[PDB]
Symmetry: D2
Subunit: 215 residues, 4 copies
């Protein structure tokens, strides 16, 4: 079902500040190593007039290395799979909502994604494309109403220094009964490995590892 | 351009808790009296599995009575028109994003609307359809970055008593240069006048009046 | 008990950005007209290194004109009286907490107030004393857990234009059983009538009127 | 200056839900190991009518193990020292503000602490003393306006299961010039080791370690 090497295909449809776009992706990862890489292409709405980094964490917690002592909500959910929904609340009032419905056929995951962003200041770092990268982060995972919730204090590093803060809340919903984990953490690191001038073509990497804190 | 009687046509496409839907509407209003009525029909995704009230304030501040001493951002923007974007932050973590692009042809306004909702608790009043109505409200309007922003403390009255709080932030963007108003308020009252069992058919009314506070 | 003319005495002890202070006040108001005036004097910590306006709304909803159709939580609570607690959440991360225990002896109200402010940016309008006034506002009043809660979208007008947003949540607790009101509003307007150079001496006025919205 | 073994003395004055109290503490820690233990005694306001856990993280990032590659803001600030201010924003609307002014004499740290809590629901876990412990956490540390800010997604584990979420923002201010760190993390774990029936006497432990994320 979930093998050492898996492929990924995705389509994202979205609107940010009223600008409509479609992004398609293909990639590969190692679910048990917690690593993955994706090649993304803008199919409609090029050139994007906003910072590409707001999209990157929307482009699957299957790709997270879970130790034996923490139930793995995500890997347990397949073959049936799971979906997630997310809000991204930025410190200057920008708010994004996103969702991913993740299905599995053979060795390929398919992602149906929707992304919407509103209320970004026109002179802020998102609409002025002044972001460099997301910093690494630690997601706090806990069960609430029988499903799994993840909260994250995120930060974008900005051109010229300084950070731009965003708070993530993701709800994750398994499509079958699975053993629920106790409170735990997932450390993440996401990076754009390469892109062309207007980010019409982007190569993206993530590494993620689950853990129980200090210790 | 904006006459004493105007017609309204709209299409809303949206997703709430992963449930996809399309709603079309036709209505009429009196821009200078600040009143309007709309007939809405669910075209795809019936029956809606969530509280219809979360949608109602997305179904145009042209329909607000502005006194002579407050510049009317909305009426001034036509014929070119305006668009708005909104976030709706509910007290139990549910978040909606919405947008409306408002165009005018002859005596008919046309609304292109997108609505997305995420992170609603499955036993909350929205997914359990336990809301009765929005209470009246007062929107705080102020200019920020050369465009108009409206903040609102909203509340849904619940079955069995009690309120469910939501905070609105709307940004309004004119498609041409207009005279900007000083800080002011818009009082609103929105009501569902009638509906059928699953809200496949709904008649909706709003009254709105701008003012400068106490006095 | 609560007469057409009432006197007010107060002492505020507080800390903002680590700066300790004491302010004493004496004033008078007309509870049934919804108006009041106060003379305030800094007794310790002069000169205050922050914008005086953050304090003003802490210096009693007895002074609000309630119409016959809305139960008056505040006037009903006396002679025993009531206390309130408030949070003030500013858009740049500054947060204040405040409380007032309001007692009545004869024709004089006595206020025991505590005020604490934290996390104000050193180059923000509060620590740079760049605020001009609070705009008028409308408080949303509703019952939650058998006591009364008030939420307010507030805004300070800034030197050189622009607004600085703050969100108030106040809980009001009667010291005896009183008839609880349905959802309603209180319009407010607060103004500094005069002050000396470092605001060691300030004369302050408020007008407040309760109402049920549109209508 | 900061030695392998240091002593700690503190006094906290505070008010929660209008209840006034004083807590004094004495303890010891190992700054370079990131560990510390404290004995706390209620001196005024016993028995506390609220969950003791809301106080525990207010009872000094000197006690955090910093690796060689991350500048240590806290240890660098002495002998002059530093102060911090914090807001604690709970998911049910409860808000606390706190501050600590940390001075050093010989081998003993002295803490002057103020704590204020407001707007806790009377049937919530704080006023009903239904909390068991804080979960471990990871603080996100970043420089903003030349001083250090820490944000934390915190959670209290509740009696009968479930979590109660709180968001911390702490600002840390050195009393002299120090080398500023790049974005980093501090993992924490705080535990009550023992207490008597009404928590008049409490023994508290914390372990904290700084790091740069994944890796
Ligand atoms: Mg936008
Ligand atoms: Mg969020
Ligand atoms: Mg939902
Ligand atoms: Mg909002
Ligand atoms: Mg401060
Ligand atoms: Mg607040
Ligand atoms: Mg309280
Ligand atoms: Mg906070």
């Amino acid at each position: 079902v979930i093998k050492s090497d898996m492929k990924i295909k995705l389509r994202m449809e979205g609107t940010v500040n009223g600008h409509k776009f479609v992004i398609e992706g293909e990639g590969e990862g190692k679910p048990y190593e917690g690593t993955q890489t994706m090649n993304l292409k803008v199919k409609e709405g090029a050139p994007l007039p906003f910072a590409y980094d707001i999209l990157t964490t929307v482009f699957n917690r299957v790709f997270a290395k879970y130790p034996k002592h923490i139930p793995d909500y995500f890997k347990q959910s397949f073959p049936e799979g799971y979906s997630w929904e997310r809000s991204m609340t930025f410190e200057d009032g920008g708010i994004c909502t996103a969702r991913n419905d993740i299905t599995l056929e053979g060795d390929c995951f398919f992602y149906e994604i929707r992304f919407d962003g509103v209320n970004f200041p026109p002179n802020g770092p998102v609409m002025q494309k002044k972001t460099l990268k997301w910093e690494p982060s630690t997601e706090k995972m806990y069960v609430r109403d029988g499903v799994l919730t993840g909260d994250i204090n995120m930060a974008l590093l900005l051109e010229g220094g300084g950070h731009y803060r965003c708070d993530f809340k993701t709800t994750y919903k398994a499509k079958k009964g699975v053993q629920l984990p106790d409170y735990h953490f997932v450390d993440h690191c996401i990076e754009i490995l390469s892109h062309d001038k207007d980010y019409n073509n982007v190569k993206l990497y993530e590494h993620a590892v689950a853990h129980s804190g200090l210790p």
